[PDB]
């Protein structure tokens with residue numbers, strides 16, 4: 620009883636190197652629409668997305684973020700943020716939004732990777748500085764994306780030991 | 788440039804009423820496999836899933852949880868938990884896992900809803916009591932699921948105001 624949605628979920632992987640080529644505007648638009656389709660605590664919809672295409676900002680962030688060095692080879696990144704003034708579920712909602720973005724990327728032949736901003740205060744401040752985020756808008760993650768430079772197998776993470784019936 | 792993965796992301800909605808009929812074992816297995824395919828900070832894979840099919844536990848949880856009353860009409864629920872001893876990203880990883888489970892459910896003609904345990908300490912204690920969770924294993928959410936009782940339109944959440952280019 621498999622299907623294409625499940626295949627995409629199983630196929631998704633973190634891609635950290637990209638070809639030097641742009642990404643179609645229509646694909647970026649669909650990734651954002653995917654992000655906004657996430658579930659949301661009390662249906663607040665606290666997400667805010669910053670689409671970064673400025674070479675200098677991308678490179679400046681790369682230098683300052685410890686595990687987002689691949690920003691220097693990405694043409695674009697989506698910064699998934701939450702309006703913490705509107706919801707204390709923001710980082711949960713925004714994690715579901717981010718996962719939709721990653722799934723969307725995979726489904727359109729792109730590669731992407733979740734790089735943490737939250738929970739690291741210093742990283743969040745980097746992102747705030749370069750994208751001019753109001754104080755209440757907190758960055759969950761920076762998602763570089765592009766066409767993969769080197770296709771890879773997805774990870775096979777199934778682990779029966781992590782399934783518990785009725786009690787632990 | 789749409790596709791079936793994006794359609795499923797757009798179609799997913801919270802379903803809170805279910806027909807009185809069981810769910811195929813193969814579907815439940817695929818939902819769990821979907822959950823385990825989530826991305827994970829440092830690839831820790833801190834998720835733990837409790838599949839609850841015991842009528843009494845389901846009903847006892849329903850009584851004690853303020854916004855999971857639909858457990859009394861669900862045959863089963865998946866409790867998404869994180870091993871907080873293994874990862875301080877647990878609630879982010881597990882939110883991505885939960886979103887995969889919801890997407891998987893939708894793709895196989897099922898309905899599901901994320902009901903919060905975390906961040907509410909009292910709810911987390913309810914779940915801990917009934918599923919015997921070790922202290923380090925923290926419950927993110929309780930996901931009742933089933934065949935929908937009343938099909939509904941998905942929510943159309945696209946909001947151009949939540950897209951920012953380069954700076955806020």
Ligand SMILES: Cc1cc2nc3c(=O)[nH]c(=O)nc-3n(C[C@H](O)[C@H](O)[C@H](O)COP(=O)(O)O)c2cc1C
Pocket residue numbers: 656657658659660661662708711712715799800801802803854855900901902903942
């Ligand atoms: C973090 C989180 C917590 C939620 N908590 C509950 C809950 O306790 N009970 C419930 O019925 N729905 C809960 N929901 C479901 C939301 O109400 C639902 O996602 C929102 O109304 C948007 O509707 P949709 O999922 O149909 O798109 C939760 C969703 C999220 C993301």
Ligand SMILES: Cc1cc2nc3c(=O)[nH]c(=O)nc-3n(C[C@H](O)[C@H](O)[C@H](O)COP(=O)(O)O)c2cc1C
Pocket residue numbers: 631632633634635686687732733734735774824825826827828829830876879880883
């Ligand atoms: C909460 C979270 C934070 C992450 N942080 C980073 C990061 O800062 N840099 C990075 O390259 N990858 C990061 N990752 C990606 C993970 O390393 C990746 O999901 C994991 O290795 C599993 O690989 P997969 O995504 O290919 O299945 C993060 C993932 C999650 C869920």
Ligand SMILES: [Cl-]
Pocket residue numbers: 774775776777
């Ligand atoms: Cl696997």
Ligand SMILES: [Cl-]
Pocket residue numbers: 942943944945
């Ligand atoms: Cl929409």
